[PDB]
Write a protein that binds this DNA or RNA. Structure first.
Lengths: 188, 191
DNA sequence: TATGTCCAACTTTC
DNA sequence: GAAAGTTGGACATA
DNA sequence: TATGTCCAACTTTC
DNA sequence: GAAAGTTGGACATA
C-alpha cells in the first residue's frame, strides 16, 4: 500500500523541525518541503498538533539512533554516551529537545510527547546499567531505574545551567561532572 | 507622605515583591505594582530604568527572601542544613519556588530575567558551598572533590529532578524527590 | 485594540 | 467521492 | 485592550 | 524661593 505519501510528509516535518524548530512546523512549510498540496497534510494526519508531536518523536528516535551507532569499549563509556555524548551531529536534535521542554509548559500535546522521550531516554539508561551490572562492571547499591532518573536529572539540570552562560559549567565541566557521578553511582 | 529616594524605591520594590509572590510575573504591571505600593504609576519610572529592571530586581529580592527563610530553619546538623538549602519541604517556600520556575522559562526570552536568574543560581551555589565547607571543617562531610564541584552537581540534580517532577511523572513524586536528594548527599559527602 | 499568523471545517469543482 | 479551493475565527502579538 | 514609557504641573520639604 | 518629591495623564506600544 502507498503509505509513502504519509512518510514523505512526515520526513518533511522532521527536516523542518531540525532546521526551523517547532515555530517553522506549519502546514504550509511542511507541505512545501514535502512537495504536496496543503490539503494532503490533513488527509494523512488528524491535525497539525499530531504531526508536530509524531514528527518530534521521530526526530528524537533518529537522535538516539545516531548516539547508538557510536560503539564504545565498555559499559561505562556507553552510559556516558547515552547520557552526554559529545558527538556534534546530535546538536540540532538536542536543540529541538530543549524547545520541546519549554513548550511542554504551555502545550499539552508537546508535553505528552516530551514525557515519552524522557521515558525512552530512561529506558536506554536502564538497559545499559542492567547490562553493565550483569557484566560485573557496575556495582549497584540501588535500582537501575532510580540510578537512571538521577543521572538524567543531573544531565538536565546541568544543561539548564550550561545554556545560561556559566563559564564555570562548560562542555568540559559537563563531561567531568557526568563521569564523576557515574563513578559514584556504579563504581562504589 | 513624602519619602526620600531610597525609602520611596523600597516601597515600590516591596510592592513588586508581594505582587510577584501573589500573582507571578504576569501580575507585575506598572499600575498594579504602583497601586499595591499606594503610589502614583509614574513613581515606578522615577526610580527604575524600566519595568524589566523592576521585575528582575524584585524577582531577585523574592529569591533572597526565600533563602533567608530556609537559612533560619534551625537545623540540627550540616547534613540537615544542606538538605534544607537544596530540597526543603517547608510549604512556606512553595510560592517562592513557583516564581523561580517561572523565571527559568522567561529567561529564554528575556535577557534581564536571564541575567537575574543567573545570579540566583550563583547565590544558591554560594550557600551550598559554604555549608559543604562548614560540614567538612566540622568533621561531618567527607570531601573527595572541591565544594564548588559538589555544589553544582547537587544543585543540578535538584533542578533536573524538579523539571521531571513538574512533568507529572508518577515514578518521580515528592517522596521520590526527597529520597533521591538524600541519596546523592550520601554519595558526595559520606563516601 | 488590531494586526499578523495559522488551521480545521466548509464549499466548489472535477 | 476525492481533490482543490475558500472560509471563519482562533491564537498570539504590534 | 492594557501595558510601558515619559513629562509638565502640582505638593511638600528645605 | 529653590529643591525635592509626587501626581495624573498623554502618548506609543506588547
Amino acid at each position: 500500500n502507498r503509505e509513502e505519501r504519509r512518510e514523505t510528509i512526515m520526513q518533511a516535518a522532521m527536516r523542518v523541525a531540525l532546521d526551523q524548530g517547532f515555530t517553522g512546523m506549519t502546514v504550509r512549510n511542511i507541505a512545501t518541503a514535502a512537495g504536496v498540496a496543503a490539503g494532503q497534510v490533513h488527509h494523512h494526519f488528524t491535525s497539525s498538533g499530531e504531526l508536530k508531536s509524531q514528527a518530534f518523536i521521530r526526530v528524537i528516535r533518529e537522535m538516539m539512533d545516531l548516539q547508538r551507532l557510536s560503539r564504545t569499549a565498555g559499559w561505562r563509556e556507553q552510559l556516558f554516551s547515552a547520557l552526554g555524548s559529545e558527538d556534534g551531529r546530535l546538536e540540532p536534535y538536542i536543540r529541538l529537545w530543549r524547545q520541546a521542554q519549554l513548550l511542554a509548559d504551555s502545550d499539552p500535546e508537546i508535553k505528552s510527547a516530551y514525557l515519552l522521550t524522557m521515558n525512552l531516554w530512561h529506558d536506554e539508561a536502564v538497559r545499559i546499567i542492567r547490562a553493565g551490572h550483569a557484566a560485573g562492571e557496575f556495582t549497584l547499591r540501588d535500582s537501575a531505574e532510580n540510578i537512571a532518573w538521577r543521572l538524567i536529572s543531573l544531565v538536565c539540570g546541568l544543561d539548564g545551567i550550561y545554556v545560561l552562560g556559566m563559564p564555570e559549567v562548560d562542555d568540559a565541566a559537563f563531561t567531568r561532572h557526568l563521569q564523576h557521578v557515574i563513578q559514584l553511582e556504579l563504581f562504589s
